[PDB]
Amino acid sequence: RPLWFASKQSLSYLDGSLPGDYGFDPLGLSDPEGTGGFIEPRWLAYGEVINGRFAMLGAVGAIAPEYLGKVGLIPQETALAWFQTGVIPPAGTYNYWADNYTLFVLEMALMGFAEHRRFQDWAKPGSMGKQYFLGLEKGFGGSGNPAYPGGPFFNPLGFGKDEKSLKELKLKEVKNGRLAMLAILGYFIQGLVTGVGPYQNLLDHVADPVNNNVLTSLKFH
Amino acid sequence: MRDLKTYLSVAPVASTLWFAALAGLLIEINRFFPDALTFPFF
């Protein structure tokens, strides 16, 4: 168990039962002494898991279009950056089949249907596989652990029916999630500072290293 | 809810409501019959 900037305070409660437990907690946020709302350590682990999952999704998605803008018949009008698709209308917008406000309302409706139920699984573990849902309830029973619900839905292929299985896979999952979280933060501050897009930025750096980092501190805009 | 009904009948709240209603009533009367010095009816 390699340690990064550990301490005799962090190393007390960070025993090792968690994946990627590196004893790194220089601020002491997991300390179970005075725990209240949204500072409880289980919720912090669940939150890291969800942030990392969404980060893997979003970090692969925010770069995919402008990569396929260069290879194939993919039409360039549908090859935008991640900041000039409608995310920041003062930086570029599009005309989809809906308004971008009706889009917001409808996407919020669908995600409300999803996330209220995921929470209600967190709060009273095993609630959702009891009330009628047009079917769709026999698969939303749960597994006692919020972040790893299992079922016929969230595990079709049946990966990891033992303990070494699950521990090794969980480690790889949280590590990739951390990497993608870092990557998304880099996306944000790169796409502000140089203001061109991460793929274009990488391709403008792979040629020459003359303008790697400190060059862009002139911050054109 | 019953506790709220009781609380709403405590002295300061009851007087506040009573006088706000009275004020609305006199204000509207004077907005309809302005500048009255006498009883001009009978």
């Binding site: 002494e33 005075g34 209240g36 709302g37 501190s217 002139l218 805009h221 | 809810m1 506790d3």
Partner: protein, 743 residues
Amino acid sequence: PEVKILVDRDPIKTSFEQWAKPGHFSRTIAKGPDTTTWIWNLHADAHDFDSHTSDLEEISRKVFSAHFGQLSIIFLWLSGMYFHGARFSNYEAWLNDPTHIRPSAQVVWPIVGQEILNGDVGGGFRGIQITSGFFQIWRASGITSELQLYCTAIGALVFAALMLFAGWFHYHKAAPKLVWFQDVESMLNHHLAGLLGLGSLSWAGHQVHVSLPINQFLNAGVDPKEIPLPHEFILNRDLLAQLYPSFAEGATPFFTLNWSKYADFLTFRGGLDPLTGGLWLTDIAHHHLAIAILFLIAGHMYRTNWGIGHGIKDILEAHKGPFTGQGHKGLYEILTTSWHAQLSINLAMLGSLTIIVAHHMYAMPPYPYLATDYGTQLSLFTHHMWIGGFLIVGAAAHAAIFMVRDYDPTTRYNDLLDRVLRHRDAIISHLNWVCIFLGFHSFGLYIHNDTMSALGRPQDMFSDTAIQLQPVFAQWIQNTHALAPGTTAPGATTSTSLTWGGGDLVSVGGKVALLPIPLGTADFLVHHIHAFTIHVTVLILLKGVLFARSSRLIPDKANLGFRFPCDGPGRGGTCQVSAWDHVFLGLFWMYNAISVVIFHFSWKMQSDVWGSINDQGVVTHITGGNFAQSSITINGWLRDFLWAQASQVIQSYGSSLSAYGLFFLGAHFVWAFSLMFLFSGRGYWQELIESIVWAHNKLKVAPATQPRALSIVQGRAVGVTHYLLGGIATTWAFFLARIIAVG
């Protein structure tokens, strides 16, 4: 040892049952009323947290959530200000022509003829002229449309709801424990470097990107609607580089350390902007940058969790010498266990700060077009002086509360406190003496002057023409401040203010913004009057604090509490020995001192500063300049200041200033009404209530909660409250009517 978050879950449950049972907090009130006295006590002890219970944890939880409630209220008041500027105001027209439109953000409904209060404030609008100076702030902010005012009103409403929710949350769901509160090192590190450092850094940022360019465009003459929006200045940068070439290099200097290349918009000019009569914005941005750097560094002094830093206990224990014994050993234990000690220190400092704000904002006007708006300047100086005085008096109140309820040499012993307690007699003796001597040599000069002026002997007066008393040191210091830029401050161009001198005068719209203020015999007399009043107030408050526990007259005074009427008529009579009564007496003297301060400033500014200037350049002051020769007698204050300037308010009936004429008289009434409570006692009143109760009993209409006369202490408190309200409101109406009428 280490620093961490520590919280309890669900300490108290949200319920209505305690609303319906009045006085749940105190066991005595909970029992219910027999007499009307109950109803008064219920309100007097409502926020006396450390008296409802003994547990320090509970008191601190209550204090934290009460602070959240106060912040929610302040946000709601800000929301109202911005909404009224957006909806019922003439701000846009004033933005078009600031030196002709007088600001107004309140209109009234036409109900009983009161629409006469909607006066002609210019710009096609009729309402009430405001004096809070909000238009000046909104112009210095860059705000140019009412949509931005709407937006800020909505944001403030959101923030108020957020504060209220956090207040509920930290008391009922996640309540921090005592060890969290008692960590002062991390708290100071955050407030120094996080609240004040990051705050002024962020604000310097906003001034560099919004206020500076929009004000450059506005002062260039551009129509306030054809100016670009602020965010354009951020998207397109050539707009910025047109006004400030330095924005082309764009943070390369800040790293290449050639900060010289920013001299474009970070200057050190000093003096006023001769176009708007305010400080250079390029000076204010640079100022805020420097202040942010200073605070961000200062927020790294105290040790929290990584060894490096300073232990407050170590600093205090290190300081001691042969005159003070062991001093400062034992103050960390005290300043972390009593809320009243903290409150006293904090109130003292905040009151002094408010007074300093008053002086600095008149003398170096920060906002554009504020210096020539005379009503706003008078209002701001006066308001802030009153606030400062009140807070300083509260400081004494809570020092006395600490001395009665918390000081304890058996478990928390400090040496310096003990030694001051052991020579309080000499302390109070010398302060008493110096106040008597100071009162003879300042007011006595006025009495000498009045008597020499009435006896036809003006050559025997104390004045600039007969017997001069020139404040040599004040003249010497402002002469040093005049020669400063270039000699002891080579980096400055003009000096800090125009009151120092140098022969520089700033005008705006044919009005006088600033010019050198002359010091003479009258200035000498007024300042010694001020020293006298402050010394007397100090004597009363410090006597109240030092003798809060015991005296040669009553040797166990701490056992009677902090607020008690007396200890009976024996020993000669012992009315008003408590420390509460000393606070009660000090309020009158604070009123006296602040009133004289605001009268001195109001007469002096009109007489030698404010006025109108002609194209040929001949300044005509509002009053003729009669402060130098009429301020030195009392008759000149009664005649040339009160009688001559009350004309505006006693002639406002029929105009839009008639509300001030009504409030003048109402305030006189409330003041005279308080004397009844101040001059009498409750025995007479209870005996009169006896007969009135008989009359009610005769008709089976007598109440079951037996009516009593007020308490002795309540009588005193009602008296001082109405006295202060009456007096301050009288001066409020007088000032506002007078200043609004002439200009």
